[PDB]
Amino acid sequence: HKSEVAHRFKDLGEENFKALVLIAFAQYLQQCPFEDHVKLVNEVTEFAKTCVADESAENCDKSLHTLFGDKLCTVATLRETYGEMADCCAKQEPERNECFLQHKDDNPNLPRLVRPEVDVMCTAFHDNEETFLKKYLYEIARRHPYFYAPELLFFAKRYKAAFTECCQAADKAACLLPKLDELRDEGKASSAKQRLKCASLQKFGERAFKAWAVARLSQRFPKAEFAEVSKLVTDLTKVHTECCHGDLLECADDRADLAKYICENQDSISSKLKECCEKPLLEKSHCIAEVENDEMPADLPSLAADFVESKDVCKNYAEAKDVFLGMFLYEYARRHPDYSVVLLLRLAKTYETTLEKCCAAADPHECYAKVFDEFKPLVEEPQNLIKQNCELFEQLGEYKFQNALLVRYTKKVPQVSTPTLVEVSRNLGKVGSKCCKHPEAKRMPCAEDYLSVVLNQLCVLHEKTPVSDRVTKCCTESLVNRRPCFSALEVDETYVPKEFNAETFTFHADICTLSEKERQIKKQTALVELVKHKPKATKEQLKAVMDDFAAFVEKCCKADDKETCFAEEGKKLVAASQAALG
Ligand SMILES: COc1ccc2c(c1)c(CC(=O)O)c(C)n2C(=O)c1ccc(Cl)cc1
Ligand SMILES: COc1ccc2c(c1)c(CC(=O)O)c(C)n2C(=O)c1ccc(Cl)cc1
Ligand SMILES: CCCCCCCCCCCCCC(=O)O
Ligand SMILES: CCCCCCCCCCCCCC(=O)O
């Protein structure tokens, strides 16, 4: 069209426009104050209005990159505040924009955002919704310069829904606090998944990305043909590459194009895309990526037909190795919405290794004849781990289950930091209380989903300050081997126990006035420390100490005088427990 700004303004709407422009500026000029971004937003919005009125008004023909760059180069203290970035303003638009991307600090040194008391949030909310949401939208955006803006907007709307509902509530905190804690964690998940995807595309490359996509796309769109899924995997690959590079505009347009493409060829891809395809521009793709699996054909052939029995397997394979393997994947994925994607990759790899070391053999059909039999153990491993861990989780509750994982992992990698073990073990616990609620056929995909950010999360920390070759081994392993690798870790028999420390096991009355979350973390921390001191303790011996301690808390909190009780019964516990654990 003649004017990009006019166009984007028209189909986005003034409200969404103003919010996205704010997010975009905050992601670049991460250091400028809120008031300064607001002024820029107004100016751009006002400019946009001009172009809507007259497609030919001055500058309305300029591209969004150019306009955006010029306005960015308007900041007077660009050099005094951002220094080197100001030099970007000396380049021509193609490089100017590229120059701006390179200086986008992925993790600046801003103070952590503190959550104020519910009454002050609700009052600030009621007294001025706009500036209240925009300011925090600003705070989140500057800290997460790579968070896809439209999605960051999608979150804002959920935050607003939570205040609207909760601030008019009888018990505001009882309504708000849990909603904010859920929004936060979810916000974290989305952010980490985005970073992980881009990171993985760099290490492993396009082939791995494509395989993962064929598997995922065909599980969701089991009725589409392999050529449609291939088409989609290709476009999808261009979109992620672009979006990872960090250019919002290119990214947003690539996502829009793909979304309309899918919606137009709707009936040819999935029947569950109707809802999503009605929604407005800003939401289409977000919706589609989240869409539920379509129902499969039911009248579907046996894989062993074309991939085992049939002659020409090797002829079809040598003619185009990746396409044939992709075909396998497509065929195997759309018949298994219940398998995790990485499990579908393990099978595809196994199949590949087999065809390679078989198609170069006397009688092919016989060399690879029993390949589907190798799959069995690959499939069962993840299944058995799930049932097993969900069972245990049903018995104990979330908390006691978290404590079990705490003992398990501490004995495996005692070298790891206690606060790290505590955190990882807790999140792992939450993955259990979130996936085990699901019926079997959906558990594995669930776990994979959550378990992957947790494992990467833990791998990054270890990256910083490495403490074990084994963790490093699993962390640098292949995407397909990461989780099985951690699963294979055995008790660390080498580990030399920490010297006892009286302090570490001294508890005061403050443990009675602390919040549930706080109390638990103190107990759990003492637990990791317990195991690090007596790594040979039994589940029996251990459970006995945890039982004494259990009461010890109550017998001292619900006691006439604390302090003393904890120092009196406290001396006892430690002396006794030390003896039981020899
Ligand atoms: C102290 O524990 C946390 C945990 C997660 C946090 C933050 C602080 C902060 C604040 C800070 O950076 O200090 C942000 C921004 N977190 C997110 O990951 C996030 C991302 C997107 C949304 Cl929509 C919501 C939350
Ligand atoms: C629809 O296309 C994809 C492609 C890759 C994906 C995902 C989705 C999802 C999300 C989903 O499972 O739907 C995750 C988590 N991916 C990765 O971890 C990943 C794996 C390998 C590489 Cl090389 C790069 C990224
Ligand atoms: C997502 C952008 C909209 C901003 C609204 C967020 C309001 C809640 C402020 C609290 C943020 C601190 C993060 C947290 O710990 O919950
Ligand atoms: C000045 C540059 C900022 C202009 C705002 C960028 C336009 C955002 C369009 C988002 C389209 C939704 C695409 C999607 O489905 O993800």
Ligand SMILES: CCCCCCCCCCCCCC(=O)O
């Ligand atoms: C057009 C379809 C292309 C998909 C290619 C299929 C390749 C499957 C190989 C199994 C995945 C192993 C991943 C890896 O180790 O890099």
Ligand SMILES: CCCCCCCCCCCCCC(=O)O
């Ligand atoms: C079920 C969540 C509780 C935590 C225990 C982890 C069990 C899930 C392990 C299965 C991993 C699925 C991904 C994969 O196949 O590698």
Ligand SMILES: CCCCCCCCCCCCCC(=O)O
């Ligand atoms: C940094 C110390 C924590 C490391 C603990 C490893 C956690 C691995 C998670 C794998 C979950 C699958 C269940 C399992 O096989 O143990």
Ligand SMILES: CCCCCCCCCCCCCC(=O)O
């Ligand atoms: C050397 C032995 C010192 C004894 C220290 C005992 C502390 C163990 C913490 C037990 C926490 C279990 C959690 C719970 O009961 O809910």
